[PDB]
């Protein structure tokens, strides 16, 4: 089994333009959305079929009530922040919590806040402390650190409860999350410029989206032009990596593709 992650986001927008919700919260297992909630629906509902089939109506009613209060909480904290900054108008407040179950059985945990797209407060579950970015953040830090039992509860949730949810959700959708579709890799060449030939290594139809593709001349690694891992829309992903050929060079290039613990080499 490879590395998996659970994530919960929160987006707070003061003075939102009509149509944009004041509060949005989405959960993720790896790259798949699993839950959703906003201030317009005021209901928490699943975003994946294998989440609705395995979670009783009890789960969604309980967390609909919980997030309604969290939405209220997020409003006053953002209002408090704008008060401290003496900020008017629209500003954003963000929060992300989650954990990862690494491949070797190891675990990680994180809890961060953001104000206007910048790192605001980062939690350190080892030292039981909050990393503050500026003076107003440090004011929030001292208030949160005064509640020592809360830091412990968050440490326990990150290291124990979050991982418990992650393993549970992995089993619910193991057909989607733990599957493997290897990439279809093809190397082609085109003359972009006069006297300039380019080699293109293109991969598509692979899942999970985690993939790394490099070009290698002989045994060494010039600069390599990379393409982003883009979602194809059918559940798979695509990416590419290109290089510029030296025509007088008698060297041989080869595309290397690694995916789900499988290394692949395409000589030219």
């Amino acid at each position, epitope marked *: 089994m490879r590395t998996h992650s659970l994530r919960y986001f929160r987006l707070g927008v003061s003075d939102p333009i009509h149509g944009v919700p004041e509060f949005i919260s989405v959960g993720y297992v790896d790259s798949h959305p699993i839950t959703t909630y906003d201030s317009v629906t005021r209901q928490k509902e699943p975003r994946a079929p294998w989440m609705a089939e395995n979670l009783a109506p009890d*789960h969604w*009613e*309980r*967390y609909t*009530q*919980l997030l*309604r*209060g*969290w*939405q*209220q*909480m997020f409003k006053v904290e953002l209002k408090r922040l704008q008060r401290h900054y003496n900020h008017s108008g629209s500003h954003t407040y963000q929060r992300m919590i989650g954990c990862e179950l690494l491949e070797d059985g190891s675990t990680t945990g994180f809890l961060q806040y953001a104000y206007d797209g910048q790192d605001f407060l980062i939690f350190n579950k080892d030292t039981l402390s909050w990393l503050a970015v500026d003076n107003v953040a440090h004011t929030i830090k001292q208030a949160w650190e005064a*509640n020592q*039992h*809360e830091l*412990l*509860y*968050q*440490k*326990n*949730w990150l290291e*124990e*409860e979050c991982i*418990a*949810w992650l393993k549970r959700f992995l089993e619910y959708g193991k057909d989607t999350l733990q599957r493997t579709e290897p990439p279809l890799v093809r190397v082609n060449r085109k003359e972009t410029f006069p006297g300039v030939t380019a080699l293109f290594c293109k991969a598509h139809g692979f899942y999970p989206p985690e993939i790394y593709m490099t070009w290698m001349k002989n045994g060494e690694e010039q600069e390599i032009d990379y393409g982003d891992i883009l979602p194809s829309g059918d559940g798979t992903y695509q990416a590419w990596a290109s290089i510029e050929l030296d025509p007088q060079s008698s060297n041989l290039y080869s595309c290397h593709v690694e995916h789900s613990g499988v290394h692949m080499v395409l000589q030219v």
Partner: antibody
Amino acid sequence: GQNIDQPTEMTATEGAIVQINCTYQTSGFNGLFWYQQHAGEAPTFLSYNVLDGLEEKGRFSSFLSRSKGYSYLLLKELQMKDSASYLCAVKDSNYQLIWGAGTKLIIKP
Amino acid sequence: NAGVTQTPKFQVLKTGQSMTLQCAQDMNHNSMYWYRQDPGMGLRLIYYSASEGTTDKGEVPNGYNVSRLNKREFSLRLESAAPSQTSVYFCASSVWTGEGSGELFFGEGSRLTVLE
């Protein structure tokens, strides 16, 4: 389903030491609470444990073992006022509070 | 702060009667709860108000109703009393329902006795 077990009643003599055990089987764990409730009055908060270890505030101590699903409330230097019912409560994975039936502590003079 | 005050301290009703329990806290808490305490069992949640603008049923909500009038007040109501509703009703308030380490603050308690 979710279960919490306290001894129904315990008796000790003043000046001594009593230990009230609390074992719990819950769906997830977000902390264990101890509450004191005197006869005919309101429960008041005593302690909170979410990590393994022993927390001590004054004559009262609270220990937690998440592995064994076990906790105890330790009262040192017993006094007649300590005679009360002691409530054990656990928060489950959905932050719901499961309550034990409570332990009626009786202090003999 | 005055804590949590609930009324009435005592009450006796006939089976058909209706009655409302009042509760309010001045600690600017956002969570409000209504428990009932009975011999030989832990506290049972009747209803709770996680925030100012929402309530939900608890474990034993049959025969009860609540109305979070505002952030400061929570009221428990019985439109048709029952001998089974003879109990001691406690009102609690927490700072936030979501935060895990938060404790409860209880009211003095209301003793109800319903007779035929």
